[PDB]
């Protein structure tokens, strides 16, 4: 499992935009920025759609007011599902990133097996990333949602 | 791999949360089952699935009792996709870990898009017996569409 102080693996995350499908090198996309990245087990699922992602939508402005250049959600879903999920959630201020084959998630050691529900998915977590180095890392406990929410990240940014 | 004339494997498909066993779901019925590589993808959302929604009543008129769609997605995405598509007449089935698809030998590796997804195909299943199996060639869409399946049922209405 990745830990605070490590650089992100040289992995790719996909996004569907106007020019079309783009494969972002993570170490390029997050270079030189303060990034809040949070992961959900799957788009259109209850906790992610009713609590986790909405929490970051409502606090997006206050997060960026404390120096956050980029807020991004990642899930083990394809980019077409991620785009439709963000439009249904009005997540225009959140960068919706797809880890279709769970390769980025596997490289972080943060995968989990949902068996017949959805195969391999991401654990629920949230990170603060400064120029590619993981500065803070909040990984949820199984079946728990208390440390990866936007309010907890908001308090972490206030610290120093 | 499944072949024309065999029964289906004793697998389950999920719907929103019941785990339909396919040997019991399709028993005593003439079933049209078609598979897509993924919910919310362009071909599946703009051509394949809408083709069966439109021709649904015509298919039922030609003797099919049940029209089902299956994809390697979880049931929450499949339900959200069916509602966005207005597919109340279609039974949207989820094979979230590709177990049903791999049992048929019809899985394909989409790599980073991605993960294991289903090949595009269409089946006519008459009391558990796959009597027509139209598996597309790579990147092809000309044997699994609703019109082809409707055509394969016409000879049942001419008693030679």
Which neighbouring-strand residues pair with B18? B15
Which neighbouring-strand residues pair with A13? A24
Cβ-contact A74, A39 below 8 angstroms: yes
- What resolution, expressed in A, was reported for this entry? 1.9
Query: Rounded to an integer, what distance in angstroms lies between the CA atom of residue A21 and that of residue A100?
Result: 13
Q: How many structural domains are present in chain A?
A: 1
Secondary element (H or E) of residue B42: helix B42-43
Tokens of A131: 């120029």
Cβ-based interface (< 8 Å): residues of A facing B: 12, 14, 23, 42-46, 76-81, 83-84, 88, 100-103, 114-120
Minimal CA–CA distance to A126: which of A116, A117, A136, A118?
Answer: A136
Close Cβ partners of B116 (under 8 Å, ≥ 6 residues apart):
A119, B72, B98, B101, B102, B107, B108, B109, B110
Query: Count of CB atoms within 10 A of residue A135's CB?
Result: 15
Cβ-contact B10, B24 below 8 angstroms: no
Query: Rounded to an integer, what distance in angstroms lies between the CA atom of residue B39 and that of residue A44?
Result: 12
Nearest to B115 among A12, A102, A117 (CB): A102
Query: Count of CB atoms within 10 A of residue A156's CB?
Result: 17
For residue B78, the SS3 value is helix
Cβ <8 Å between A117 and B99: no
Tokens of A14: 């996909």
Site of tokens 């597919």: B87
Structural method = X-ray
Cβ-contact A45, A118 below 8 angstroms: no
Give helix B75-85 / helix A79-89 axis angle, nearest 10°.
Answer: 70
Contacts of B39 in chain A (CB under 8 A): 80-81
Sign of CA dihedral A12, A13, A16, A18: negative
DSSP secondary structure string, chain A?
---TTPBPPS-EEEEE-SS-EEEEEHHHHTTTSEEEEEEES-TT-HHIIIIIHHHHHHTHHHHHHTT--EEEEEESS-HHHHHHHHHHHT-TTSEEEE-TTSHHHHHTT-EEE-TTTTSEEEPPEEEEEETTEEEEEEEPPTT--SSSSHHHHHHHHT--
Query: Rounded to an integer, what distance in angstroms lies between the CA atom of residue A97 and that of residue A100?
Result: 9
The domain in which residue A122 lies consists of: 1-160
For residue B50, the SS3 value is helix
A151-A87-B139-B122 Cα dihedral, nearest 10 degrees: 100
Query: Rounded to an integer, what distance in angstroms lies between the CA atom of residue B12 and that of residue A116?
Result: 9
Close Cβ partners of B149 (under 8 Å, ≥ 6 residues apart):
B32, B34, B59, B122, B124, B132, B134
Query: Count of CB atoms within 10 A of residue A80's CB?
Result: 21
Strands B91-94 and B66-71: parallel
Tokens of A26: 């993570």
Tokens of B81: 């996709």
Secondary element (H or E) of residue B101: helix B99-104
Supply the DSSP symbol for B58: H
Cβ <8 Å between A44 and B96: no
Sign of CA dihedral B25, B27, B33, B35: positive
b/e burial code for range B20-48 (CB count within 10 A of at least 16 → b): bebeebbeeebbbbbbbbbbbbeebbeeb
CATH number at residue A67: 3.40.30.10
Site of tokens 């995350």: A13
Minimal CA–CA distance to B78: which of A120, A16, A42?
Answer: A42
Tokens of B110: 């989409």
- Tell me whether residue A54 is exposed, middle or buried, using C-beta atoms within 10 angstroms of its C-beta: 0 to 12, 13 to 18, 19 or more: middle
Cβ-based interface (< 8 Å): residues of B facing A: 12, 14, 19, 38-42, 72-77, 79-80, 84, 96-99, 110-116
Assign residue B121 a region: left if phi > 0, alpha if psi is -120 to 50, beta otherwise? Answer: beta
- Tell me whether residue B60 is exposed, middle or buried, using C-beta atoms within 10 angstroms of its C-beta: 0 to 12, 13 to 18, 19 or more: middle
For residue B135, which phi and psi values (nearest 5 degrees)? -90, 125
Nearest to A101 among B19, B77, B114 (CB): B114
A44-B73-B116-A138 Cα dihedral, nearest 10 degrees: 30
Peptide bond into B114 cis (omega under 30): yes
Minimal CA–CA distance to B15: which of B84, B85, B68, B66?
Answer: B68
Tokens of A3: 């830990």
Close Cβ partners of B85 (under 8 Å, ≥ 6 residues apart):
B45, B49, B50, B53
C-alpha distances out from residue A56 to A38, A91, A149, B138, Å: 9, 9, 8, 40
Question: Considering only alpha carbons, which residue of chain A is nearest residue B12?
Answer: A116
Supply the DSSP symbol for B154: G
Supply the DSSP symbol for B44: I
């Amino acid at each position: 499992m990745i830990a605070q102080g490590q650089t992100l693996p040289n992995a790719t995350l996909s996004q569907l935009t106007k020019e079309g499908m783009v494969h972002h090198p993570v170490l390029e996309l997050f270079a030189g920025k303060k990034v809040v990245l949070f992961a959900v087990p799957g788009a259109f699922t209850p906790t992610d759609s009713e609590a986790h992602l909405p929490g970051y939508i409502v606090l997006a402005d206050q997060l960026k007011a404390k120096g956050v250049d980029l807020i991004a959600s990642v899930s083990v879903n394809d980019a077409f599902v991620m785009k439709a999920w963000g439009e249904a959630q009005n997540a225009e201020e959140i960068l919706m990133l797809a880890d279709g084959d769970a390769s980025f998630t596997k490289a972080l050691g943060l995968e989990m097996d949902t068996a017949g529900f959805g195969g391999l998915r991401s654990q629920r977590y949230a990170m603060i990333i400064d120029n590619g180095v993981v500065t803070t890392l909040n990984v949820e406990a199984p079946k728990s949602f208390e440390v990866s929410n936007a309010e907890t990240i908001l308090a972490a940014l206030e610290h120093h």
